[PDB]
DNA sequence: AATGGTAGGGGAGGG
DNA sequence: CCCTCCCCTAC
C-alpha cells in the first residue's frame, strides 16, 4: 500500500532487506517492524541507516546516532511543551 | 486458534498439505463432508484469512 | 516445554482478555453470528439493529446503488473544534463533556429517516431531493403538520415527537440505557474487583461505539449502504449549535468569572483562575446542571474531571493532572495526543 | 424446557435440488417447478453440549419493488400482473446470464402493502415481493433492475442491502449465539453418528432423554437414500419454518398507516437488551449492591437556531405553494383516504408464511 | 472483499 | 517557502 519505493517508510526498507535475504520473512499486514538508526556519513538519508535490532546487536562497529536522537526525537516535543513557558530545551542541550 | 495462523499453526499445515501431499485438509477439518471457494483478501489483511466450514 | 508453554500461554491470553465471552455477548446483543462481530464492519451491526426494529412496524427500507450514493449531496456541516490558547494553566481547569452527544441529539430532536420531510428551501411537491432519494409530497401535508414539526439548524423539516416517533431513537435509547446502567454499576464499586471494572469498561466502550456507528450509518458517503447527507448534516449542525449555546451560557454568567479556553466537538474546557480546586468541583457541577437543564430531555452535560496543573498545546493535544473526584488524592497523569501516548 | 433447543453458533447456506421437504411451486407461476432451492445449514450445540447440524428448508431471499398497478385492482388483475412481471423478470435474467419454463432464478412475485422508511410517508404503499431462488445472485438482480436492463424504466429496489442470513434471522427472531426453539424436527437415518466411536463415547442420559422425547424412529427419522447424512457431527436434523417457535414471539405494531399516534389510538424495543440488563443486575447483586435507578430533572428549554426566522419564512412560503386552492382545512382524522380496500393485501410479516412447504 | 464519518499535527523527502 | 505522502491520534 505504498505509492513507490521512494515513498516507502523506514521500516519498509528493513522489512524489504529481510525479505531479500529470506523470502519467508514477509510481515503480516499492519505489523510493527522494529528498527534503530545508526551513525553514518553526512547528508545520508534517515531511511539509509535504518538498522534492525538484530543487525544492530550483531554489528561490531554499529553505534546509535546520539546526535540525531537527541535533536530530532527529544528537542522538538520538549520545545513544544516548554515554549509555552518561555524557555527552550535546545540551549540546555547545546550547553552539554 | 493459534497466535499466527497464516505463516504458522494451521496455515503452515494447510499450505504443506496443499503443496506437498496434495491433500485438502480444509475439507477434512470441516463439519460437513460434502458441499465445501475463492481467496479472501479482506480476511487475510484484517482478520482470519482462513475459512473452515462450521468453525 | 518451549512449545507447550507457547500454546498454553496463547490460550491463557485469550482467556485473560475475555475475547470469546465478550464476542459472544456482542453477538447475542446485536443479533449477528460470532464470526461477523470481528469479521464484518459496524454497518452490518447497525443494519441488523435497524432491520430487526423496523420489521415489526412494516417499514420497507430503500436500498440505493453505488451511483445513487455517489450522486448524494456533499456534507456541509462540520464539528466545532475550538482553537486553544496555548499556555500553562496553574489554576484549576474544569472540563465538561456531553454524554453520547450525537445519539442523545438523535433521540431528543427526533432525527431519523422516517421522520424527515425535506429541506425547508426547494420544497415543490412535484419533486423533492433529500438524501439518495427523489420523492413527492401530499397536497396539504405541510399545512396539516404546521404545528407538529421541527426545523433542523441546516434547514431540514422533521416531524415532532407527537407523531411518528423515530425508530433510531428507540434503538439508541435502549443502547444508551444499557450503557448508563453499565457505567453506574462500574462506578458503584471501588477497588473491590479490578478485573470486573475492566470488563465493565470494555462493555461500556463497546456500547458507546455501537451508538456512535449507529449515528455513522448516516454520513457514510463512501461505502454506505443507506446513507443520508441531510440527516447527518442536521445532527452535526445541531451538535455544533448546542456546543456554542453552552459556551454562551457559561460565559454569560457573572457569578463565575470563567472563560472557555478550549473545546472539542462536545468537550468544554473552562478556566477558573485562583479557585482553590475545591470550589472548582462545585462550580463545574453548577455549570453542568445549568447547561443540562437548558437543553432537551436526553441531552446531558457531565462534569468529567478537573485539570489543576494543565498544558494546552494545540488542538487534540494537551496534558494535565486529573482529579476525577474531590476525595481523590493522587492525580492521574492524563495526556492526549502528545508523544507520551503515541 | 419443552423445546428442542439448538444454539446458533455458525450458519451457512447451499443450493440443492428440491425434495418433499422443500417447496417446488410458486404462487405466480404454479405450473413451473423449481430447478433448485436454497437450504440453510445451522451448526449448533444442544444444551447437553453435543453438536448438531440443522438443515432449514423453505427459506427464500426476497426484495421489494414499487407496484406498477393501482390500489383499485379486483384481486384478479393483481395475479395477472404478478405473473406477467414474473415471466418478464425470468426471461430477462436468463438472457442476461447467457415460454419454456424452469424457474432457475426467480421463484415467485407477490403484491404486499408497506410503509417506506426513507422519508416521511403515512399511507399504505403497495410493493412487489420478488422471491429469488439463489441468494448469491440477489445483488446482480438488483443491479440489473436498477439500471433498467429488464423493464422499460429504472426501478427503485428495496431491502437488498440486507444479507440473506441476516434477513432470515430478523424474519424468524433469531439471534447469534442464542437458542433456536423448535417444536418438532426430522432426524437423519443414523440418529447418532459413529465417525470413530462418537456414538459410544458421547452417549449420555440427558441425550437419551432428549432423543426419546423428540425422536420416534417411525416418523421423525428420514430415509437413508433420500436424505443421506452430510455432516461430521453426532446428530443431524432437518426442520421447517413452521417448526421454529422463536417466531410468533415478535410484537407487530400497525401504527404507521395513519395518524394513530397523534389521535391517541392504542421502552424495550430491542429484545436482546433485556437479557444483558438482567445479567448485569444479577451480577451486581452478587456484590450486595443496592437496586438501580436514575433521577430525572426538569428542563426549562424553550431552541431557536441562528437562522430560525428565515426557515420559518421559507416554511410559510412552501406551505402556501403546496396547498389546495381554498377548500376545507386538512384534519388528522380525514387526511388519509379511508375505505381504500387495503385489507385484501398482505402485510409483509403475513406474506412470509406463504409458499412454505406445509408438510403433512 | 470488504469497508461509518469528522478534524489535527508532525516528520521525511523532493522542489 | 511550499507540497505530498505516511503515521497516529482525538472526537
Ligand atoms: N469514534 C467516534 C467518536 C466520536 N464520534 C462522534 C459522535 C459522538 O457523539 C461525538 C463525541 O464523541 P465522544 O468520544 O466524546 O463520546 P460520546 O459523547 O458519544 O460519549 P461519552 O461522553 O459517554 O464517552 O463524536 C464518532 O462519530 N465516532
Ligand atoms: Ca462525550
The string of DSSP letters for D73-113 reads: --SSHHHHHHHHHHHHHHHHHHHHH------SSEEEEEEEE
Sign of CA dihedral C116, C119, C124, C126: negative
Closest CA to C117 of C143, C149, C139: C149
Confirm if D119 and D130 have CB atoms less than 8 A apart.
Answer: no
Sign of CA dihedral D123, D128, D133, D137: negative
Resolution of the experimental structure, in angstroms: 2.8
Confirm if B30 and B24 have CB atoms less than 8 A apart.
Answer: no
Task: Round to whole Å and give the CA distance between C127 and D322.
Answer: 12
Q: What are residue C130's DSSP bridge partners?
A: C133
Confirm if C142 and C100 have CB atoms less than 8 A apart.
Answer: no
What would the DSSP string read from start to end of C125-165? SS-EEETTEEE---SSHHHHTSSSEEE-TTSEEEE-TTSS-
Instruction: Let me know how many helices (H) and strands (E) chain B has, helices first.
Output: 3, 0
Which chain A residues contact residue C88 at CB under 8 A?
84-85
Cβ-defined contact of A80 to C313 (cutoff 8 Å): yes
Confirm if D116 and C60 have CB atoms less than 8 A apart.
Answer: yes
Cβ-defined contact of C311 to A80 (cutoff 8 Å): no
Q: What are phi and psi of D290, to 5 degrees?
A: -80, 175
Q: Reduced to 3 states, what is the DSSP secondary structure of residue C36?
A: helix
Residue C213: Cβ within 10 Å count: 16
Beta carbon of C215 within 6 Å of any ligand 1 atom: yes
Cα–Cα–Cα angle for D83, D89, D94, nearest 5°?
Answer: 125
Residue D135: Cβ within 10 Å count: 20
Task: Round to whole Å and give the CA distance between C60 and D117.
Answer: 6
Beta carbon of C175 within 6 Å of any ligand 1 atom: no
What would the DSSP string read from start to end of D237-268? EEE-TTTB-SSS-S-----TTTTHHHHT----
Task: For residue C42, say whether its CB is under 7 Å from any atom of strand F.
Answer: no
Q: Which of C266, C298, C305, C316 to mutate to test the pocket of ligand 1 (most atoms within 8 A of CB)?
A: C266
Task: Give the minimum alpha-carbon distance from B25 to chain A in angstroms, rounded to a whole number.
Answer: 22
End-to-end CA separation in angstroms for chain D? 25
Chains A and D touch, contact meaning at least 3 pairs of CB atoms under 8 angstroms apart: no
Confirm if C244 and C80 have CB atoms less than 8 A apart.
Answer: yes
Cα–Cα–Cα angle for A53, A57, A59, nearest 5°?
Answer: 110
Which of A24, A26, A29 comes nearest B45 by C-beta?
A29
What would the DSSP string read from start to end of A11-71? HHHHHHHHHHH-TT-PPPTT-----B-B---TT--HHHH-B-HHHHHH-TT--B-HHHIII
Q: Which three cell numbers stand for residue C155?
A: 434547514
The C-alpha R_g of chain A, in whole angstroms, comes to 17
CA of C331 to C1' of E5 (A): 34
Task: Round to whole Å and give the CA distance between C238 and C242.
Answer: 6
Q: What are phi and psi of D166, to 5 degrees?
A: -60, -45
The 3-state secondary structure of D162-213 reads CCHHHHHHHHCCCCCCCEEEECCCEECCCCCCCCCCHHHHCCCHHHHHHHHH
Confirm if A21 and A9 have CB atoms less than 8 A apart.
Answer: no
Confirm if A8 and A1 have CB atoms less than 8 A apart.
Answer: no
Closest ligand 1 atom to residue C104 Cα is 9
Beta carbon of C101 within 6 Å of any ligand 1 atom: yes
Residues D3-12: b if buried by 16+ CB within 10 A, e if exposed: ebbbbbbbbb
Task: Round to whole Å and give the CA distance between C131 and C73.
Answer: 7
Longest CA pairwise span in chain B (Å):
30
Q: Reduced to 3 states, what is the DSSP secondary structure of residue C275?
A: coil
Q: Which three cell numbers stand for residue D228?
A: 443421506
Q: Which three cell numbers stand for residue A11?
A: 521500516
User: Which run of H or of E encompasses C305?
Assistant: none
End-to-end CA separation in angstroms for chain C? 36
Q: What are phi and psi of D6, to 5 degrees?
A: -130, 120
Task: Round to whole Å and give the CA distance between D288 and D290.
Answer: 7
Task: Round to whole Å and give the CA distance between D163 and D156.
Answer: 18
Task: Round to whole Å and give the CA distance between C286 and C274.
Answer: 18
Which residues are within 8 A (CB) of C98 and not within 5 positions of it... i.e. 6 or more apart? C104, C242, C266, C299, C300, C301, C302
Q: Which three cell numbers stand for residue A31?
A: 505489523
Q: Which three cell numbers stand for residue D129?
A: 415481493
* Chain B touched by A28 (CB under 8 Å): yes
The C-alpha R_g of chain B, in whole angstroms, comes to 11
Task: Round to whole Å and give the CA distance between C108 and C93.
Answer: 30
Strand order in the sheet with D235-239: D10-16, D37-45, D51-56, D235-239, D186-187
Task: For residue A6, say whether its CB is under 7 Å from any atom of strand F.
Answer: no
By what technique were these coordinates determined? Answer: cryo-EM
Task: Round to whole Å and give the CA distance between D329 and C143.
Answer: 8
Q: What are phi and psi of C73, to 5 degrees?
A: -65, 145
Confirm if D241 and D56 have CB atoms less than 8 A apart.
Answer: yes
Task: Round to whole Å and give the CA distance between C22 and C203.
Answer: 8
| Ligand with minimal distance to C265 CA | 1
Separation of CA C208 and ligand 2 centre (Å): 10
Task: Round to whole Å and give the CA distance between C115 and C158.
Answer: 5
User: Which run of H or of E encompasses D310?
Assistant: helix D308-321
Task: For residue A3, say whether its CB is under 7 Å from any atom of strand F.
Answer: yes
Task: Round to whole Å and give the CA distance between A3 and A10.
Answer: 14
Closest CA to C24 of D10, D170, D164, B32: D10
- Cell 426566522: give the residue: D309
Question: Could you say which nucleotides of strand F lie within 7 A of any protein CB atom?
Answer: 5-11
Confirm if D143 and D96 have CB atoms less than 8 A apart.
Answer: no
Dihedral of the CA atoms C65, C212, C266, D309 (nearest 10)?
40
**Between β-strands C59-60 and D106-116, what pairing exists: parallel, antiparallel or unpaired?**
parallel
Task: For residue C79, say whether its CB is under 7 Å from any atom of strand E.
Answer: yes
Q: Which three cell numbers stand for residue A66?
A: 546520539
Q: What are residue D360's DSSP bridge partners?
A: none
Confirm if D126 and D69 have CB atoms less than 8 A apart.
Answer: yes
* Chain B touched by A1 (CB under 8 Å): no
Beta carbon of C89 within 6 Å of any ligand 1 atom: no
Amino acid at each position: 500500500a505504498y505509492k513507490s519505493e521512494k515513498t516507502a517508510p523506514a521500516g519498509a526498507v528493513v522489512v524489504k532487506r529481510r525479505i531479500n535475504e529470506d523470502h519467508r520473512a514477509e510481515p503480516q499486514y499492519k505489523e510493527r517492524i522494529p528498527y534503530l538508526v545508526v551513525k553514518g556519513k553526512q547528508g545520508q538519508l534517515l531511511r539509509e541507516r535504518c538498522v534492525s535490532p538484530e543487525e544492530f546487536l550483531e554489528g561490531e562497529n554499529l553505534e546509535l546516532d546520539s546526535e540525531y536522537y537527541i535533536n530530532k526525537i527529544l528537542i522538538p516535543p520538549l520545545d513544544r511543551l516548554f515554549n509555552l513557558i518561555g524557555i527552550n530545551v535546545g540551549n540546555w542541550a547545546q550547553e552539554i | 486458534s493459534g497466535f499466527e495462523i497464516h505463516n504458522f499453526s494451521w496455515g503452515y499445515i494447510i499450505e504443506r498439505c496443499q503443496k506437498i501431499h496434495q491433500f485438502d485438509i480444509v475439507r477434512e477439518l470441516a463439519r460437513v463432508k460434502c458441499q465445501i471457494k475463492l481467496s479472501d483478501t479482506w480476511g487475510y489483511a484484517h482478520s482470519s484469512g482462513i475459512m473452515i466450514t462450521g468453525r | 516445554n518451549y512449545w507447550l508453554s507457547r500454546a498454553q500461554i496463547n490460550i491463557q491470553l485469550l482467556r485473560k482478555q475475555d475475547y470469546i465471552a465478550r464476542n459472544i455477548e456482542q453477538a447475542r446483543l446485536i443479533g449477528i453470528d460470532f464470526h461477523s462481530v470481528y469479521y464484518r464492519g459496524s454497518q452490518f451491526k447497525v443494519e441488523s439493529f435497524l432491520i430487526r426494529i423496523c420489521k415489526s412496524e412494516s417499514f420497507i427500507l430503500l436500498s440505493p446503488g453505488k451511483k445513487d450514493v455517489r450522486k448524494q449531496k456533499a456534507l456541509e456541516c462540520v464539528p466545532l473544534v475550538m482553537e486553544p490558547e496555548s499556555a500553562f494553566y496553574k489554576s484549576p481547569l474544569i472540563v465538561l463533556d456531553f454524554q453520547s452527544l450525537y445519539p442523545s441529539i438523535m433521540i431528543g430532536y427526533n432525527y431519523c429517516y422516517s421522520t424527515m420531510i425535506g429541506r425547508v428551501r426547494e420544497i415543490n411537491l412535484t419533486e423533492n431531493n433529500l438524501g439518495v432519494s427523489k420523492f413527492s409530497l401530499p397536497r396539504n401535508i405541510l399545512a396539516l403538520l404546521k404545528n407538529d414539526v421541527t426545523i433542523a439548524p441546516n434547514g431540514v423539516v422533521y416531524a415532532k415527537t407527537s407523531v411518528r416517533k423515530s425508530t433510531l431513537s428507540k434503538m439508541l435509547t435502549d443502547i444508551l440505557d444499557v450503557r448508563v446502567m453499565i457505567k453506574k454499576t462500574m462506578n458503584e464499586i471501588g477497588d473491590d474487583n479490578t478485573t470486573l471494572k475492566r470488563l465493565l469498561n470494555n462493555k461500556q466502550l463497546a456500547l458507546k461505539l455501537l451508538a456512535n456507528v449507529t449515528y455513522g450509518y448516516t454520513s457514510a458517503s463512501f461505502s454506505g449502504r443507506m446513507p443520508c447527507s441531510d440527516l447527518a448534516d442536521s445532527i452535526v449542525q445541531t451538535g455544533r449549535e448546542t456546543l456554542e449555546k453552552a459556551i454562551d451560557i457559561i460565559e454569560k454568567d457573572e457569578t463565575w468569572n470563567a472563560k472557555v479556553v478550549y473545546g472539542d466537538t462536545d468537550s468544554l474546557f473552562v478556566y477558573l483562575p485562583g479557585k482553590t480546586a475545591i470550589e472548582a468541583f462545585s462550580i463545574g457541577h453548577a455549570m453542568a446542571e445549568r447547561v443540562t437543564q437548558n437543553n432537551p430531555k436526553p441531552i446531558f452535560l457531565k462534569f468529567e474531571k478537573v485539570y489543576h496543573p494543565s498544558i494546552l498545546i494545540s488542538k487534540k493535544r494537551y496534558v494535565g493532572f486529573s482529579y476525577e473526584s474531590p476525595s481523590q488524592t493522587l492525580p492521574i497523569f492524563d495526556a492526549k495526543g502528545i508523544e507520551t501516548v503515541r | 424446557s419443552d423445546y428442542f433447543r439448538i444454539q446458533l453458533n455458525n450458519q451457512d447456506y447451499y443450493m440443492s435440488k428440491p425434495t418433499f421437504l422443500d417447496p417446488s411451486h410458486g404462487e405466480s407461476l404454479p405450473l413451473n417447478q423449481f430447478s433448485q432451492v436454497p437450504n440453510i445449514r445451522v451448526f449448533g450445540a444442544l444444551p447437553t453440549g453435543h453438536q448438531v447440524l440443522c438443515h432449514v428448508h423453505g427459506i427464500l431471499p426476497y426484495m421489494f419493488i414499487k407496484y406498477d398497478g393501482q390500489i383499485t385492482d379486483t384481486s384478479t388483475l393483481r395475479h395477472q400482473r404478478c405473473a406477467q412481471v414474473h415471466k418478464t423478470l425470468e426471461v430477462k435474467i436468463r438472457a442476461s446470464f447467457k415460454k419454456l419454463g424452469n424457474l432457475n432464478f426467480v421463484a415467485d412475485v407477490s403484491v404486499v402493502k408497506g410503509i417506506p422508511f426513507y422519508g416521511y410517508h403515512v399511507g399504505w404503499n403497495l410493493f412487489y415481493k420478488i422471491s429469488l431462488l439463489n441468494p448469491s445472485c440477489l445483488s446482480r438482480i438488483s443491479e440489473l433492475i436498477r439500471d433498467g436492463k429488464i423493464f422499460g424504466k429504472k426501478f427503485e429496489i428495496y431491502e437488498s442491502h440486507i444479507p440473506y442470513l441476516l434477513q432470515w434471522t430478523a424474519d424468524f427472531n433469531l439471534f447469534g449465539c442464542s437458542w433456536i426453539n423448535v417444536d418438532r424436527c426430522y432426524f437423519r437415518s443414523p440418529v447418532l453418528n459413529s465417525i470413530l466411536d462418537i456414538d459410544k463415547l458421547t452417549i449420555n442420559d440427558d441425550l437419551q432423554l432428549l432423543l426419546d422425547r423428540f425422536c420416534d424412529f417411525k416418523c421423525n427419522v428420514l430415509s437413508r437414500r433420500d436424505f443421506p447424512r452430510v455432516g461430521n457431527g453426532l446428530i443431524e436434523i432437518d426442520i421447517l419454518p413452521q417448526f421454529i417457535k422463536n417466531r410468533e414471539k415478535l410484537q407487530h405494531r400497525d401504527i404507521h398507516h395513519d395518524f394513530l399516534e397523534k389521535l391517541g389510538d392504542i421502552k424495550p424495543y430491542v429484545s436482546s437488551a433485556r437479557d444483558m440488563i438482567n445479567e448485569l443486575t444479577m451480577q451486581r447483586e452478587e456484590l450486595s449492591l443496592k437496586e438501580y435507578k436514575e433521577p430525572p430533572e426538569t428542563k426549562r428549554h424553550v431552541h431557536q437556531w441562528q437562522s430560525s426566522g428565515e426557515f420559518e419564512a421559507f416554511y410559510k412560503k412552501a406551505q402556501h405553494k403546496t396547498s389546495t386552492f381554498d377548500g376545507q382545512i386538512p384534519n388528522f382524522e380525514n387526511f388519509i383516504d379511508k375505505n381504500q380496500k387495503f385489507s385484501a393485501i398482505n402485510t409483509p410479516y403475513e406474506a412470509l408464511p406463504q409458499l412454505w412447504p406445509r408438510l403433512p
